[PDB]
Structure formats: C-alpha cells, structure tokens
C-alpha cells in the first residue's frame, strides 16, 4: 500500500545483433457497460446495409494493446534501425503491470468526490490458450501512446460472431470472460509475465537495386530465339517466320527464369481533384471481395507498387495504408489531412496496383482470325513468381494472428508485420464490481534481433534524414501546447540489396 | 503423416474479426463528389469504423473460387470460403478519368493470393499445392 510495486523503465539498448526496447506508460481504466455483458447489433445503431451487418457483444473487460511500432521505438531509435539494418524480428516479450490505484467517485451536487479505495481489486488475465477472439490484429485505436508522457485510456473489449442480418444463428458463440481464471490485484500487488515469440521470417527493410526483368547481363547475347517477323511486308500470302537472337539490343523479349508476383488491380484516383471523374465511385467503383453475400472492400490488398515510376499524384483507391495527421477529424477530412503512404520501393519486383498484370492471347489465329488479346486484371500465384511483402511503417501494426484454418498461403498479413499462429496473448483487465476506475503503470519490453548490411555497393546509400531549414517547430516533437505530432510516416526500406 | 482433420465450423466469419467497439486508425475514401456545389469533384476521407464495417482494412482474405452454375430444386465453411454460385468479387478494368467512368468487372475464378485462408471439404509429380484431395 505504501511501497512502489514496480519501477519506471523506458530506453533502448543497442547490443551487437540484438535490440532491447522497453516502453512504460500510464493508463486509466473506467467501468464499461455498468459491469454487464451487453449484446450489440446494427439494429441498435440503425443497421443500414447488409454489408455492414454484425452481431456481437460488449464486455466490461478492457485490454492492453501495444501492437503498433511507435509504442516501442522513439523516432530516433527507429531511424537507427531502417538506416543500418536489412531485417528484424521480435524474439522475447516481457510484460509488467503494477502500481494499481483504484479510485471511486461519489458525486455530490456540482463537485464530484474522489478518494482512494484501499480494499478494491483489479482483475487481469491473459488468453494464452487462444480460446477467446483475437481482436489485436485489425489495427484498432487505443494502443499505447507514441509519446511517453501521454496518459491513455484502456479500450473496451468486444467481439462479433456468426449472423444473418441482425439476427443470430445456432452456431454463434457467446464467451463469458468471468469463466476464465484471473489474477486479482489490490493496490500493492503487481502483474508480470514473459513471452517467447515463435519463429517468424525477418521482415525485409531494404529496397532491391535491380528490377525483376533487368537481371540480365547487358553485354552478352542469349542463345534463345524469339519470333521477330510474321510477314515480310504488305501483299497477299505474305506469312513468314523470322527468328532473331534475343540480346541487349532488344531486352524486352529475352527468356527469363522468374516473373513478378500476384496482382489484383485497384482503381486509381488522383489527388488533384479535377483529374477524377465527376461522379460517386467511392464504393461502386472500388475493388472488393465478396463473402457470404456480403461485399468486402479490398483494403489494403495484396502487396503491389502504388504507382508507375515518375507519376506520384495518383494512388490506388483502397490499396494504401492511409494514416492521418494529428487533429484530423473523424469524418470527411480533406486530402491533405490524411497521410497517404505509397509503395515506391516495391515497384521493382511487384506489379503496379493500378495497371494490368499483362496480356493473354484470347483466340486462335488463322487466315481469317486476327490474334486477339485481353488484359489480365487479376492474377493469382503461378510457379516462378517472386514478390515483396508490404512495408511496416512506424505507425503501423507489428503482428496479427493467423486465423486457425486448414491451410493458408504466405500468412504474412496484408497491413504489414509478422503473421503468427500464437501471437502475444491478449491481456484483459476490469474493475471488480463494488462508480469506480483504476490507474497505474504499464511497462512492455520486446527484444528485437537484427540482420546487418553486408553489401559491397560503392556509392553511398539513400538514408533517412531530418531536414535543416529553420522550421517553426522541430519534427517529431511538441508544439507550444504539448501536442506530440508525427508529421510523416516512415518506411523501413532505405538500404539496398541485389535481386 | 497427415495433418489432423478439422471437424468444426468456425464461429466467426472472416470479414468480422474486428473489434466492434473501437475505430481503426486507418482512413478509407468515403466521398468523391461534393454534391453541394453541383457535383464539383472533391476528395474526402473518413475513419473506417464499426458504423461502416465493409470498408475496414483486413489482414486476410477468403480463399480461392472457381465458379459453378446454380441449379434449383458445404454451407458450414461459408465463413472463410466464397459461395460457389457467386462471384469472388470485383476488379477495376480501366483507369478512371474526367472523360471516362470507372468500370468494374466480376471475378469468376480467383487463384491463390498471399494472405488467403480457406477450409477444405497424391500423384508423383514435380510439384503440387495443398495435396489434400477433393
């Protein structure tokens, strides 16, 4: 009651090939749903469309979410990663919760009363058997703050289940979290547990210096032949076959061992407002995968370059993680109030999102039938394809749980990060019913492992830097109101590798 | 040595894995026309949120589909796999522009993509994919 149940740890220790990052924050937990499990469905909120239909529950339990990078890395630390390293991946997670303080409010007339409640408890437990839904993969808000001095609020835990419209079905599952053995903490207890990440492939934080189709030697001729001329000239019965040697003169036709990865085309919209069509094509014209008669928008989509080299005004409609600048409203914000990330780096080995994958010959030529081709809008995996996965921005997610299923292909999640079949367990918390809320400290520590840049490239790399032009306020810092603002999203890919 | 057979129906659908009470930090493209200024083009973003769940960015997508014809007279896996009589979804055929409307077309067959998950229902060869028989 009178002695600190834990200490304050925030720092980063760069040791050899490993990195140890520790983040500590101060949180507040209110009471949700008046200590009740409450059913929720769109019928409560008006239930406009069948696409948006959901059936689920809301629990008083709150949960801790550290799933975003900027929780762990200060901007400068992050810089020391993207600049010097060709890869990273988490090894150990060590979580601590302590210094619980339970407060109670008896409101009398205008001024409310707040004082310590000593005998109150705060229940906390983790789901390490994965019997509960896993909501930490969808990039929800409520995570630890980017800036240490920010005191935050634990999000409310909710989940959804099978449904037809707002009605339920027999197979819908209802989980009571009280049914779980959980630790109970008074103002002197603390909570701690450690976690060992399962083996995941290094995330790549390098940009290929070569393009998939230029891997050739420019000085030498292949020994493969291609068909140059099917006629000599104009006339009657001019058909002929003329093979040439593929070589540096014409490089488009050479035989190649590998081909770019999969593509599902996104509609491309311009940031100059007037190059866009004068109609509402936001939902009607967007790409979307359909499931059980419910249409789903394809966001962010498979990993594909955002635009052709040299044109940057345009962006794929849903094909890009779109963050937002601080102060950005929650509705109908302008084009510049959002920060639209673009995959410039992965264009070399991956198809462009807003372009076709290619052509196919759609009929059989004869004297009476021309060769007819048609575009490939969507292209799935073929033998030989190589591709790069989406980058992880400093604001983006770290991991996501792989839905437990029969099979999967390349589980790495589409918003970035590390797909895992046993991700870091959820951490649930609530105030035991006895008006009540609790507060305290949370320190989370992940140990990251590195892959150093070994390359022999002669000229200097492109590195991430901070400008020097006398701005009113420094980037990644506070304004005069103490508002920590992250001005631009930071890719992980600066150093270069060969293809 | 074969994988343990799965004999259960998933409680939740693939697209609904979200937390219904909390917004994502990601934005989607809500509104492409003003409508007040007599259809001046405009570009507006809004938070993907539980109010509109169709638009939220998802980490995984349903498995492959190769369409069949519906005849009138496997419904348990309808969570992670598309309906055999319905299109997999839409793609955009052309670039929009001021003089051309955005066009979309149906995906009748869809191969594997990175990030697909699916539920189920060997030759001697150089390669196969997911050998589990049909």
């Amino acid at each position, epitope marked *: 009651v009178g002695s600190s149940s834990g200490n304050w740890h925030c720092d980063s220790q760069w040791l050899g090939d490993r990195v140890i990052t520790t983040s500590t924050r101060t949180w507040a937990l209110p009471t949700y749903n008046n200590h009740l499990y409450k059913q929720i469905s769109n019928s409560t909120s008006g239930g406009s469309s069948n696409d948006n239909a959901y059936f689920g529950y809301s629990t008083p339990w709150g949960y801790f979410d550290f799933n975003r990078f900027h929780c762990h890395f200060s901007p400068r630390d992050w810089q020391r990663l993207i600049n010097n390293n060709w890869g990273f991946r988490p090894k150990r997670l060590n979580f601590k919760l302590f210094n619980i303080q339970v407060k109670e409010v008896t409101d009398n007339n205008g001024v409310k009363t707040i004082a310590n409640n000593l005998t109150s408890t705060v229940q906390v437990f983790t789901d390490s058997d994965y019997q509960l839904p896993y909501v930490l993969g969808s990039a929800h808000e409520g995570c630890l703050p980017p800036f240490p001095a920010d005191v935050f609020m634990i999000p409310q835990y909710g989940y959804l289940t099978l449904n037809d419209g707002s009605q339920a079905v027999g197979r819908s599952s209802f989980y009571c979290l009280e049914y779980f053995p959980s630790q109970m903490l008074r103002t002197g207890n603390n909570f701690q547990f450690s976690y060992e990440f399962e083996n995941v492939p290094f995330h790549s934080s390098y940009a290929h210096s070569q393009s998939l189709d230029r891997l050739m030697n420019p000085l030498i001729d292949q020994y493969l032949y291609y068909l140059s001329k099917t006629i000599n000239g104009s006339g009657q019965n001019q058909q002929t076959l003329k093979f040439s040697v593929a070589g540096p003169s014409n490089m488009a036709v050479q035989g190649r061992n590998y081909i770019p990865g999969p593509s599902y085309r996104q509609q491309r919209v311009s940031t100059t407002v007037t190059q866009n069509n004068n109609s509402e094509f936001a939902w009607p014209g967007a790409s979307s995968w359909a499931l059980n008669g419910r249409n789903s928008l394809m966001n962010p989509g498979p990993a594909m370059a955002s635009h052709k080299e040299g044109e940057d005004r345009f962006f794929p409609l849903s094909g890009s993680l779109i963050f937002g600048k601080q102060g950005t409203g929650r509705d109908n914000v*302008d084009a510049d109030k959002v920060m639209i990330t673009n995959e410039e780096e992965i264009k070399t080995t991956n198809p462009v999102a807003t372009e076709s994958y290619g052509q196919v010959a759609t009929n059989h030529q004869s004297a009476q039938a021309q060769a007819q081709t048609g575009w490939v809008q969507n292209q799935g995996i073929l033998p030989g394809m190589v591709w790069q996965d989406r980058d992880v921005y400093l604001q983006g997610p770290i991991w996501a749980k792989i839905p437990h299923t029969d099979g999967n292909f390349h589980p790495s999640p589409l918003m970035g990060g590390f797909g895992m079949k046993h991700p870091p367990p959820q951490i649930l918390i609530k105030n035991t019913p006895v008006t009540q809320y609790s507060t305290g400290q949370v320190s989370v520590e992940i140990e990251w492992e590195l892959q150093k840049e070994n390359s022999k490239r002669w000229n200097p790399e492109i590195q991430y830097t901070s400008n020097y032009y006398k701005s009113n306020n420094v980037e990644f810092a506070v304004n005069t109101e103490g508002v920590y603002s992250e001005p631009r999203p930071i890719g992980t890919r600066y150093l270069t590798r060969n293809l | 040595n074969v994988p343990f057979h799965s004999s259960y129906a998933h409680s939740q659908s693939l697209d609904r894995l979200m937390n219904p009470l909390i917004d994502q930090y990601l934005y989607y493209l809500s509104k492409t026309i003003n409508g007040s200024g007599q259809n001046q083009q405009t570009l507006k973003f809004s938070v993907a949120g539980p109010s509109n769940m169709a638009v939220q960015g998802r980490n995984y997508i349903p498995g492959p589909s190769y369409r069949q014809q519906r005849v009138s007279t496997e419904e348990e896996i309808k969570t992670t796999n598309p309906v055999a009589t319905e299109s997999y979804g839409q793609v955009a055929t052309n670039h929009q522009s001021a003089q051309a409307q955005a066009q979309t077309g149906w995906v009748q067959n869809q191969g594997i993509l990175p990030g697909m998950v699916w539920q189920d229902r060997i030759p001697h060869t150089d390669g196969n994919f997911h050998p589990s028989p049909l």
Partner: antibody
Amino acid sequence: QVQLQESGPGLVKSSETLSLTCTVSGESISSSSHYWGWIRQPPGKGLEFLGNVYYLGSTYYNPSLESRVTILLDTSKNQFSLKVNSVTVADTAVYYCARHGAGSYSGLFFDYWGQGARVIVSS
Amino acid sequence: DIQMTQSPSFVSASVGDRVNITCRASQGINSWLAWYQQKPGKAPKLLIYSASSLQSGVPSRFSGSGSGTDFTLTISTLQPEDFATYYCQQANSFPYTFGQGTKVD
C-alpha cells in the same frame, strides 16, 4: 503563413539555361502535402502556367513550353527550382512561385504567391 | 488548351459604382474557376476559388456565381483601394489558363 521568395540571375544570355529557385518559409514541403507550381507573366500580358510539382516529386509540365522546363524539388533545403533550357528573347517575364493547393482545391488555384522574380533574357 | 475571354477588356467605373467582370470558358469547365487581383507590379492574389466561395483574406464585397459556361465577378460598393486587373483561371483540365485581363478604373 507561407512566405515565398524567388532568387537566381536577373539576366541570362540567350540560349543559356535559366534557373530560379523558390525557398518556402512557413511550411515543410515534405509534410505539407500540397502542390507547388510556377507561372510566368510576359510583360503586359496574361499569366501562363508553367507546371507544378507534387510534394513526392511528381511533376506536370505545360505542353506549350516544349520540353524546356524542368522543375526540381529539393526537399531537404525546403525549396524547389525552375530550369528552362535554350532561353530566347521571347521567354522574358516576371516568374511567380506559388503554392498550388488548399484542402478542397489542392493543385488547382494558387492561394499563396511569390514576391515575383524579374528575368530578362538578352544577348 | 481552353481559351478564356473576359468580356470587358477595360472597364472604367469609379468609386461606389457596382462593377461586374465576366469571363467565358471556351468549353464547359464544370464551375471550376479562380478570380485573381493584380495591383501593378506586385504578384496577383486569389479572390474567389471554385465558383462562388470567397477566400479568407478577401473582403465581403467580392462575389460571383458561375453557371459553368458563364462567370461573373461582381465588385460591389467598389472602394478606391482596388483598381487592378482581374484574371480568371480554369481548374477543369490541364493546362490551366488565365484569360487576358480586365483592367478596372
């Protein structure tokens, strides 16, 4: 508030490249998310657009000018440079720098303008 | 390109008297416009963006409503502070074009 200053030579020999630079104070080109563009005012005549450059480096040029103009974006020093090649007597006017965008009208109407820069092409 | 022609080339109208300047786009611009004001020798400054939406800096007196092939800038209660040329701009399609100029007196 966004103050825009142009600098460079005020006299250029004919068929010598022309170079001006606009150093924007009050915003950060990398994180402002607005278009930056040039126009030119041949004396006593209507202004004609030259081109603009989006903050990521993409560029639009005016076809009337025939592939002479090139707009380079130096983001670290927070300034962008106009370069027009093979200058002639006809290509002499006051060159304005401008911020091409706003919330609703980004890359359309020029809200904030340079002080102006006189360039006289002569032999 | 799309031409822009402001109908009065030189409109001499003194203080207090209402003035209206009209510029017609060669082809429909879908109400995308931008009237500007240039006092002699200084760079121009924006006045009305889109069709009728006033800029924050500019005084309430300036106004104008385009039908999309027709546009007018009505300077109401003209004060002596502004005698300047006036340009209009299309935003509809590249390249952006500023027609002529309307010098007012």
